[PDB]
Curated annotation (Swiss-Prot):
Record remark on domains: The TPR repeat-binding motif mediates interaction with TPR repeat-containing proteins.
Protein name per UniProt: Heat shock cognate 90 kDa protein
Taxonomic lineage from the root: Eukaryota, Amoebozoa, Evosea, Eumycetozoa, Dictyostelia
Residues of the full protein shown: 5 to 219 of 700
Subcellular location: Cytoplasm
Binding site for ATP: N36, D78, N91, F124
Length: 215
């Protein structure tokens, strides 16, 4: 069963700004999503320093990135703390901090730019610089696996997830814009991932799917 929600007014505005106005360093999205993956890993790691048994659902702490030219998708998977269902509504549909609300005014005035979005915990929405639709699958130790989706337009959905179990963590699937497809190209994505993960302390693996006709 599919459950439907409205973005908080500010999140709608953030998303319109990202979708409808111009910004020339769209590649910032990758920095933001890798940073979010790192933070979720930090969090499970932190818990495990008290109770190593929290890692039982999935023992590796790593990040995987999978460009798929045929599906037109860029997938980023981490084995971080994951989000419960309520985590997901809170984190991907709302703003918590008043600081985040006022940053939104600074941003919308043009005084701040999109690249500082992470300082205010909404770096995720930068995915919409390069993607028309975003799917987030997540699994936290204290809840079931859920799947969130939004193509923006003021609304998002959440459903029980019946796809491949993560064990623990988050998988973000960006359905790429027609014009932003070179982010799926091997050399470009390799360089970008390298550039934007230099201080990340978790292993990051990049997949390359090659497809050749056999003659």
């Amino acid at each position: 069963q599919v459950e439907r929600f409205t973005f908080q007014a500010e999140i709608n505005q953030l998303m319109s700004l990202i979708i409808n106005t111009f910004y020339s360093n769209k590649e910032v999205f990758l920095r933001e999503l890798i940073s979010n993956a790192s933070d979720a890993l930090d969090k499970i790691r932190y818990q495990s320093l008290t109770d190593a048994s929290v890692l039982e659902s999935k023992t590796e702490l790593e990040i995987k990135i999978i460009p798929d030219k045929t599906a037109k998708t860029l997938t980023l998977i981490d084995s971080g703390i994951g989000m419960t269902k309520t985590d997901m509504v809170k984190n991907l549909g709302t703003i918590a901090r008043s600081g985040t609300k006022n940053f939104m005014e600074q941003l919308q005035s043009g005084a701040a730019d999109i690249s500082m979005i992470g300082q205010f915990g909404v770096g995720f929405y930068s995915a919409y610089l390069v993607a028309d639709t975003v799917i987030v699958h997540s699994k936290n130790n204290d809840d079931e696996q859920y799947v969130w989706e939004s193509s923006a337009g003021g609304e998002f959905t959440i459903a029980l997830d019946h796809t491949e179990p993560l064990g623990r963590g988050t998988k973000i699937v960006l359905h790429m814009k027609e014009d932003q497809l070179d982010y799926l190209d091997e050399t470009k994505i390799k360089n970008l991932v390298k550039k934007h993960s230099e201080f990340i302390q978790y292993p990051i693996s990049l997949l390359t799917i090659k497809e050749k006709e056999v003659d």
